Amino acid sequence: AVGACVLCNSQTSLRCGACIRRPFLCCKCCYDHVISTSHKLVLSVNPYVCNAPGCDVTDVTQLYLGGMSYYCKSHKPPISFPLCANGQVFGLYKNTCVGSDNVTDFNAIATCDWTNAGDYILANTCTERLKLFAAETLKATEETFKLSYGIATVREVLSDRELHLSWEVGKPRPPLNRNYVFTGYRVTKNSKVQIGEYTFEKGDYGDAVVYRGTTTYKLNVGDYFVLTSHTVMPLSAPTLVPQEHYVRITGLYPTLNISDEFSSNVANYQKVGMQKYSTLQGPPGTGKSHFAIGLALYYPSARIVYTACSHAAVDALCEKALKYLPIDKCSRIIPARARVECFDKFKVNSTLEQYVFCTVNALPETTADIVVFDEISMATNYDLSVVNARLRAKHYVYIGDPAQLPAPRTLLTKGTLEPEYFNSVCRLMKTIGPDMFLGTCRRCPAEIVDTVSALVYDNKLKAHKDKSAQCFKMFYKGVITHDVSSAINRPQIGVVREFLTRNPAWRKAVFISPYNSQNAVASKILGLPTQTVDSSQGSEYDYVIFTQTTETAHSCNVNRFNVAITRAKVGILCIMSDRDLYDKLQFTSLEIPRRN
Amino acid sequence: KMSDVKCTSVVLLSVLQQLRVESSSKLWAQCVQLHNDILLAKDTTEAFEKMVSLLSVLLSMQGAVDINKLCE
């Protein structure tokens, strides 16, 4: 049970059991972490407590090894050794470890609670191994916090799936979302017995709530539901394989003249094969995706794997691939999960096909020629190491836009992240240079392009295609019918009704919402299939509808707004109360009785 | 000196084994036959001929990242 010092990679057998994640520490490093922190309990091949029954002095600095065993100050044998001695702590290979100076920031990491960007701002700039450990303890703290939510029980049954529930008084109630699952226990006297997994969702009124179940069990009244926790595996792969070069392209083989529509990018195609990996920054989904598939085409015999974090993202990508590829294609995507449905084409598990698509967390453990991560502007270094561990290939390509939407990383609530610090490759792009770049829109109406380039961009884009049928009724925000703090505004649909009918052909559009529950209620007084701004970022549409909640910080987020409005091809419309943005948007707003 | 090439043959054959090469009877049989003959070979040069003849087999597949090991 030995290892390497998380700071010196020296041999040791210690773990600061007081620190959450139990990381290996060299001697000197351990001495310093313990001398400067409330962290005191050190674990070795055995725990370190006084073995005389009753003594619970667990501040290691007080303890003494006796004959073979450990002892307090009092119950110590006549002969012994003091453990915490001579600026070190006794452990295996004590006389070999080197020690170093990364202890300060180390304790800073181990002691923060991820509440202020500073501990982040350091999390993204420490050493790689340290970065790993940081991500580990971050996700662990997230999980532990998740436990803090309350418990739910049943109060009375209404239908097969209509029900009235009872919450814990004085406890945080988590939201109704497809990303939550509850183990159901009913108790006889005796017989606290699990009944199955059950998700939830708000019905048509309170507190009638729908639920999807694992089995057809009959419901009762002495039932209750616990949100099911989760574990977190430790990681060991670096975030970025050391960057390299070569003198000549290897591994991959171009064609000849096939598909000139992808012309200029061949230049990038060569240098991609010429490096170990590289990045590409591009405004929304323009050359992005387009270029990826083009390269894939370029080297035919090249086994290629696409992957991202957002399900809808990999879905839009796989359909764009279907648009041009032999089939001869699969998206080995989701086992017994897929609470939201996705791919419709091929298997989920053979790993024979050359062009395999999937989601990161559901990836196998396989090899390939190249691999193209996507939407790095949303992922965390955690996931990057995950993919570098599960997979192993020659040339990697990461793509995204540091002006898009990052990981929610809900835990932070004080300040804001500079995009530069979302994760490693984010820095890499923002720091030295994106190595390869693309600067033109092939997907969006020119007018919204003008608006955005006037905003978050520095007026640095161009494209084609202009009109029409665009507006920004600055319709005051009606009642925030917020079920949970997740926002809903029914009188916002109170004017969608006026475009639920006035719509001549705007009947096949997609609706987009800042919040999930206002999106669900849009599915209620239905107009069309809708989605969330996050679940966007991957597809374009001719018409798109947009209503907003209040001017809350989450709502008025410029980046969310940008990535939302940048999903349309010919028609668009967005409805905020809007004190300022409608001054920045360039359309033709109207008034409630003025809708043609 | 010849001891060197003999021990080398032994190590190499062990490697081939570790690579699950015995899942094809013809290949594994040729390999074992070569290795045996090496261990009984009593000249200096015929040894090398059979040696490279064998090593080719390892060269076949792509399980052993050659460049990495060639880090000297």
């Binding site: 000549r248 | 040729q30 040696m51 490279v52 090593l55 060269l59």
Partner: protein
């Protein structure tokens, strides 16, 4: 053993008896110095022995745990250490014949079959690109494994026969580059 507490008592009794037998005093006084020193040896060995046993347990535990560790250590790394030892022995062995093909393979000259030795017998190698060919394919004789092979049936990845004479740097950017060469020894 020395610094033990009971050794203090044994030392006191021994020194007291030393002074007594030095003064050459009575016999009735040593009746203690015997019934007070025998006990010292008694109350003393019954503790030097007891720590001694633990002192052997410590050994016969450490000497076991060590090998138990390095055991599973060595059964973790075979398909890794083995290869590097192999290539170490290779480099030390030093035979131009080998080094040739080894470098060639670092490059790409992977043979798709066993190298034969019969004066007849066929050979199938792979070539990635032009210079490889130029550094190797010279006329119709092939120099591989420091041996001379007669070039007979070039074919590119489209599985179509290609004219040997056509192979040159100018028109080369038009060929299914993984070229499969076949030949025979001298």
């Amino acid at each position: 053993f020395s610094s033990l507490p009971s050794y203090a008592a044994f030392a006191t009794a021994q020194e007291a008896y030393e002074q007594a037998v030095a003064n050459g005093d009575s016999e009735v006084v040593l009746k203690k110095l015997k019934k007070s020193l025998n006990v010292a040896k008694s109350e003393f060995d019954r503790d030097a022995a007891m720590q001694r046993k633990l002192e052997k347990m410590a050994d016969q535990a450490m000497t076991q745990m060590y090998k138990q560790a390095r055991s599973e250590d060595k059964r973790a790394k075979v398909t890794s250490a083995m290869q590097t030892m192999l290539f170490t022995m290779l480099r030390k062995l030093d035979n131009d014949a080998l080094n040739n093909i080894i470098n060639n393979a670092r490059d790409g000259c992977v043979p798709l079959n066993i190298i034969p030795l019969t004066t007849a017998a066929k050979l199938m190698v792979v070539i990635p690109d032009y210079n490889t060919y130029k550094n190797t394919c010279d006329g119709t004789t092939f120099t591989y494994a420091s041996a001379l092979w007669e070039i007979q049936q070039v074919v590119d990845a489209d599985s179509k026969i290609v004219q040997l004479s056509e192979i040159s740097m100018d028109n080369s950017p038009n060929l299914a580059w993984p070229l499969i060469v076949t030949a025979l020894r001298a």
